[PDB]
Design a binder for this molecule. Structure first.
Ligand SMILES: CC(C)(C)C(=O)NCCC1CCN(c2ncnc3cc(C(N)=O)sc23)CC1
Ligand SMILES: [Zn+2]
Length: 274
């Protein structure tokens, strides 16, 4: 009887009636950290082809172009590597969710790695478009921690495999490649979810689009996004809640209703001092 509200979701979490939260995030959560959506006219990455020495937008994430000229991609890597951008309130909200034993899994479309930098361990993360936290030799397939090629990336050298001399590429998923193996965790995670949180994306592209329907029909789906569009708007469920407008405000409103404001402020304080 009647729509669930943001407060109703907050109350379920406070009661630990929702304690296996699956979170899905996109570009919208990282704009307040100073990373625009790549497609943003004027400011976004795809609108700065000259700045990266690219023939066209997609090229920075294409394998044949990468092997012809790895330097534009490595320019992006240098900018996006950990330490450059700061997580914002949205990332720390998810971190708090984790610290309180409420996070089952956080699925991210972002490559900025800000979830990790916020202190969420890799085991809770499914970085569905890959990550800079690890790298792989393109010839022999030797894996490397991201830190092991940091010096070369910061020094504008194309890192190389000690074993076979192959170019070592960050584990970002390029156009036409398979999604990472960890993505198959959705098979167990989604039936297990007792709350679905979607932040700063409308999950309009597959296979993310279908995943919104993988949770059971009793599970509330909370969308915090500019607009109510995508699969959630196409196929609403009685226990869906939409918090529209600015993601930062939506998240901060939820944080307040949860009673975590002072806890958030202390966490952010501590973390900034690192
Ligand atoms: C879907 C595949 C894997 C084929 C793909 O497009 N790979 C290239 C990397 C993606 C990463 C996510 N992505 C983004 N698009 C617009 N804005 C952002 C902001 C991102 C961020 N803040 O990490 S990722 C991203 C599209 C290109
Ligand atoms: Zn190698």
């Amino acid at each position: 009887k009647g729509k669930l509200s943001l407060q109703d979701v907050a109350e379920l979490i406070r009661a630990r009636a929702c304690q296996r939260v699956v979170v899905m995030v996109g570009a919208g959560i990282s704009t307040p950290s100073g990373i625009p959506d790549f497609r943003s006219p004027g400011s976004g990455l795809y609108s700065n082809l000259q700045q990266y020495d690219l023939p066209y937008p997609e090229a920075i994430f294409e394998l044949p172009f990468f092997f012809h000229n790895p330097k534009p991609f490595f320019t992006l890597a240098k900018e996006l590597y950990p330490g450059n951008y700061k997580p914002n309130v949205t990332h720390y909200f998810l971190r708090l969710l984790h610290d309180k034993g409420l996070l089952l899994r956080l699925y991210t479309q972002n490559i900025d790695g800000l979830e990790r930098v916020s202190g969420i361990p890799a085991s809770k993360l499914v970085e569905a478009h890959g990550t800079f936290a690890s790298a792989t030799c393109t010839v022999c397939q030797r894996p490397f921690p991201g830190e092991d090629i940091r010096a070369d990336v910061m020094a504008d050298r194309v890192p190389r495999c000690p074993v076979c001399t192959g170019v070592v590429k960050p584990d970002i998923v390029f156009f036409g490649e398979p999604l990472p193996q960890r993505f198959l965790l959705h098979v167990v995670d989604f039936p297990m979810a007792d709350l679905l949180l979607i932040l700063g994306t409308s999950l309009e592209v597959e296979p993310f689009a279908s995943l919104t329907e993988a949770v059971r029909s009793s599970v509330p789906r909370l969308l915090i996004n500019r607009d109510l569009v995508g699969p959630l708007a196409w196929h609403p469920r009685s226990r869906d809640v939409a918090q529209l407008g600015d993601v930062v405000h939506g998240v901060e409103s939820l944080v307040e209703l949860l009673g975590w404001t002072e806890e958030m402020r202390d966490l952010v304080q501590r973390e900034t001092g690192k």
